[PDB]
């Protein structure tokens, strides 16, 4: 309506900034929000700034002015532009000594305005020669000059790619005038930090834009001044942060060291001079200062990464760079060294990529120095009570250390390192926390260690198993993880199998160690299944009472997975016997739940993993499937309304079926019936998917083909109803996805059954409508169906029924062929992201194999009907596609062509 009363806006403002209650503060916000969204926002903000009651309301007004300029600039008549600029400049003038938080918002507003006002050319020049001589203007002029380059990359402004480029070079033109201005500011005797911080922040900001001249900056007092305050112990924390950030900006602005070598040299020498100040900062407990130094150092190595790699030791590659990091790495506070982790990754990645290991020897000592530094950083506190927690802040750090070590270990040698870490573990009467940390880094690399030097490897394992239970919980835990990583050494030295198992079994029987043990057991079962028939008695006995060990669901599943992996290696005769026992504990638990909070998920997941990995070669499993089905059907039927449980139910059944195959035909019809009846009231799309599995497994057997077609036709009726709704495709992408995975299984197992059917006509129709659905999973499923369908009129001409299939597709192609091609071309140019192009091209490709001359006409018609693009471009695209000899070429043609739109 009309503009709100000022008393009302003043009321809402005071709430938002002083009312402790959450419910009210939210309410004021929405009203102020609607005020900001409204047309009155301009006028209200302007009034609030003229009235300038207090800091709160001027801040709200300045912010609102800024927001309306960076979102709603379009709804301003051209004539208004000059006047709004005059307002903001009068406002920032009048309110400059009110609050800095208000000056920034207004500064931001003015910057957003200048970037959007091409009628305001040369704004940097305008602003400086208008305010530079007034000494009280300088703080906000610098502030505008600081936020202006930052706003060029504003996600809130999102300036076009071309307009952005014009902006940047326009700014590049005036970068001298601001540097000149910036020089004059410091060009005084005994200048305070407050002015210095503005100068550095501004300089850094123009550096980040990449428009400052390297050569002019190399010999300039500002740089010397940067390192000067960075050397002086007396400098405050805030001046420090400003100075540091500007140095990192200077470095960052160097993109190619060669083109900016004068500046490069100036910065290199500059930062090396800071090591004394680092040590002084660490002498005090000035952690803020040391973090700044480590960033400057890390940024330096990032800047000169190419030179450290290409020509190490020499000149620009002076390895004192890396030493500065190793100094930082030695710091007792782990927040210091993690600053440098990304550089180390990038360094290792680059050495690995350019495979010239002639040079690599020089780096080894540096990496092993780093590794020892990280090894001590991984040490837990001696008063640590439990297992090492991964979830907490420090446990997160260890994992980043663990990952960094895996990626750098090739520069030292995994074996060399593994043995050396273990050696040190008897010298010096080590406290539990020094042992754990060494065991931890050992676990990180234990997989990559070569099993050639077996003696040093197999004796480490022997050392870990003889550790008593008396040792600290966290030491038992990490040693369990190390053993788990050493399954290949248990595989090559089978005598150690029983001791390792016995050791892991002990850990399993202790509650806080179970999951780590169960995981390690799973590893052993997976790698050493070839010869573990003896131990199966124990694994089954664990399974018989799995929920007693207080396991995580994952560790539990992994355990049962392990025992099923070795069951598959057992003699075929005992498999069918033990499998039924393996499943019976699950079936019993499920049976209790039917008479029982009841959530059968875990036993469904445990049954599923057993089937999934009980895969022998021949079948014993289909004998067990009969035992499973009745309890699953009731379980399914009890929770038929709950999608999450049904989905896990169908996942279980998916793997039970995949395990058997063409056997277990006793389940098909009773399952199909239940699926269709349930789907009728609850459209779980996983019945479609489960259906696709039955079709994948039983589609060739012509005895089942009728029942399967009936299933499809029954399932499609509630399916089409679903997709018929408003936004029906967008709202049920799972249904589209699973429907066309189903359709695909039909069209590749028994195509003619589907094509001669009546339901194929709606399926094809939905496919054509689905080609424009912006959902990656669903769209892959659709394009795949179209491709496989059309390919049926070409594929396997060796078999008899080829000519029938040929005719059926020709009909479909006759009826729909021209509409598909128009749809496919539409989705590529307007609807979907470029990653769909290879999927479209494959469908288009199959259409050419079926009838290229007709297709040349179809495509010509499609290119004809298009709503900027020259006729020549349509022609040579048509030329590119139809003359393609490989499918790849159509994709390239679409890739290139898509760009035009």
């Amino acid at each position: 309506g009309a503009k709100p009363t000022l008393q009302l806006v003043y009321q809402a403002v005071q709430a938002l900034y002083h009312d402790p209650d959450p419910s009210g503060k939210e309410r004021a916000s929405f009203w102020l929000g609607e005020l900001q969204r409204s047309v009155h926002a301009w006028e209200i903000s302007d009034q609030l700034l003229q009235i300038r009651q207090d800091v709160e309301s001027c801040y709200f007004a300045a912010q609102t002015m800024k927001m309306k300029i960076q979102t709603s600039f379009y709804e301003l008549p051209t004539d208004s532009h000059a006047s709004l600029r005059d307002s903001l400049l009068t406002h920032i003038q009048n309110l400059k000594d009110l609050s800095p938080v208000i000056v920034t918002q207004l500064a931001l507003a003015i910057a957003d305005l200048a970037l959007q006002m091409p009628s305001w050319k040369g704004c940097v020049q305008t602003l400086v020669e208008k305010y530079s001589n007034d000494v009280t203007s300088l703080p906000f002029l610098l502030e505008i000059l600081t936020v202006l380059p930052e706003e060029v990359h504003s996600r809130s402004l999102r300036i076009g790619a071309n307009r952005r480029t014009e902006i940047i070079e326009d700014l590049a033109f005036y970068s001298s005038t601001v540097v000149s201005l910036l020089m004059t500011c410091v060009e005084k005797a005994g200048t305070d930090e407050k002015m210095l911080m503005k100068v550095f922040r501004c300089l850094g900001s123009w550096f980040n834009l990449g428009v400052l001249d390297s050569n002019f900056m190399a010999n300039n007092k500002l740089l010397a001044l940067l390192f000067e305050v960075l050397q002086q112990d007396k400098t405050s924390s805030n001046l420090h942060e400003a100075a540091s950030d500007c140095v990192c900006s200077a470095l960052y602005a160097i993109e190619n060291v060669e083109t900016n070598l004068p500046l490069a040299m100036q910065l290199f020498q500059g930062v090396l001079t800071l090591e004394t100040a680092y040590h002084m900062a660490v002498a005090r407990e000035d952690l803020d200062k040391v973090l700044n130094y480590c960033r400057i150092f890390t940024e330096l190595c990032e800047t000169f990464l190419e030179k450290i790699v290409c020509t190490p030791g020499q000149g620009l590659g002076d390895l004192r760079t890396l030493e500065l990091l190793l100094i930082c790495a030695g710091h007792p506070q782990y927040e210091v060294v993690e600053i440098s982790f990304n550089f180390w990754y990038r360094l290792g990645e680059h050495l690995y990529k350019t495979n010239d290991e002639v040079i690599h020897g020089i780096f080894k000592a540096y990496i092993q120095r780093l590794l020892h530094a990280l090894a001590r950083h991984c040490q837990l506190e001696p008063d640590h009570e439990g297992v090492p927690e991964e979830t907490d802040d420090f446990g997160e750090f260890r994992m980043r250390v663990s990952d960094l070590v895996k990626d750098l270990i090739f520069l030292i040698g995994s074996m060399e390192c593994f043995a050396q870490l273990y050696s040190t573990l008897k010298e010096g009467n080590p406290p539990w926390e020094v042992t754990e940390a060494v065991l931890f880094i050992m676990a990180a690399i234990a997989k990559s260690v070569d099993p050639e030097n077996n003696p040093t490897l197999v004796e480490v394992l022997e050392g870990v198993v003889r550790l008593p239970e008396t040792v600290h919980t966290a030491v038992r835990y990490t040693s369990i993880e190390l053993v788990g990583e050493m399954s290949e050494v248990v595989d090559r030295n089978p005598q150690f199998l029983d001791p390792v198992l016995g050791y892991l079994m002990k850990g399993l029987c202790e509650k806080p160690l179970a999951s780590a043990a169960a995981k390690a057991i799973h590893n052993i079962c997976s790698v050493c299944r070839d010869h573990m028939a003896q131990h199966f008695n124990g694994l089954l006995e664990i399974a018989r009472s799995l929920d007693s060990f207080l396991l995580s669901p994952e560790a539990a599943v992994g355990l049962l997975k392990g025992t099923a992996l070795v069951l598959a290696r057992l003699p075929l005769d005992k498999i069918t016997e033990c499998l039924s026992e393996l499943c019976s504990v699950q079936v019993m638990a499920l049976k209790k739940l039917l008479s029982q909070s009841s959530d059968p998920t875990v036993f469904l997941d445990r049954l599923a993993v057993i089937f999934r990995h009980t895969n022998p070669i021949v079948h014993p499993c289909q004998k067990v499937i009969q035992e499973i089905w009745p309890v699953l059907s009731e379980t399914l039927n009890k929770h038929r309304a709950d999608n999450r449980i049904v989905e896990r139910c169908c996942r279980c059944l998916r793997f039970a079926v995949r395990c058997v195959g063409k056997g277990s035909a006793a389940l098909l019809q009773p399952l199909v019936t239940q699926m269709v009846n349930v789907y009728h009231v609850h459209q779980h799309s996983c019945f479609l998917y489960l259906g696709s599995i039955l079709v994948d497994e039983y589609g060739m057997e012509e005895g089942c083909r009728q029942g399967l077609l009936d299933m499809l036709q029954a399932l499609c009726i509630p399916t089409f109803q679903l997709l018929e709704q408003q936004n029906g495709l967008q709202n049920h992408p799972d249904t589209v996805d699973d429907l066309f995975r189903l359709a695909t299984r039909f069209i590749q197992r028994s195509p003619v059954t589907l094509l001669r059917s009546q339901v194929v006509i709606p399926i094809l129709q939905w496919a054509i409508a689905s080609t424009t659905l912006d959902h990656r999973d669903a769209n892959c499923s659709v394009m795949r169906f179209l491709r496989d369908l059309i390919h049926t009129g070409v594929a396997n001409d060796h078999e008899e029924d080829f000519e029938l299939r040929k005719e059926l597709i020709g009909q479909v192609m006759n009826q729909l062929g021209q509409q598909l091609v128009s749809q496919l071309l539409h989705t590529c140019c307007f609807c979907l992201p470029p990653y769909t192009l290879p999927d479209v091209a494959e469908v288009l490709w199959e259409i050419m194999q079926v009838d290229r001359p007709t297709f040349c006409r179809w495509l010509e018609n499609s290119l004809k009907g298009l709503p900027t693009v020259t006729h020549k471009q349509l022609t040579d695209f048509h030329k590119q596609v139809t003359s393609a000899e490989e499918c790849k070429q159509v994709c390239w043609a679409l890739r290139d062509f898509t760009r035009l739109f």
Partner: protein
């Protein structure tokens, strides 16, 4: 600094393209926590948030890339490794 499993590989980069040019192009999608370019006009970008990676794959793929020297090329942007599930709740489904 920090890293993530929200990673894309970029391809078709001009040889004069720097990791700063790459970061500047990919930041249109969200915050870049790790970036790198190699010798062969190829690169990686890791995003702080998965949804920002998805934007990059959807909107930055096949776009015009301009290196700091002014060299232009149309790049390829795709997820490193197995792609993320599209919107809607997770479903277990066989693939490849």
């Amino acid at each position: 600094s920090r890293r993530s499993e929200n990673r894309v590989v970029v391809s078709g980069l001009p040889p004069s393209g720097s990791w700063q040019d790459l970061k500047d192009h990919m930041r249109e999608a969200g915050d870049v926590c790790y970036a790198d370019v190699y010798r062969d006009g190829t690169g990686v970008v890791e995003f702080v948030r998965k949804e920002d990676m998805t934007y990059a794959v959807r909107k930055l793929d096949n776009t015009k890339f301009r290196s700091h020297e002014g060299e232009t090329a149309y790049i390829r942007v795709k997820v490193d490794g197995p792609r993320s599930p599209s919107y809607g709740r997770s479903r277990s489904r066989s693939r490849s």
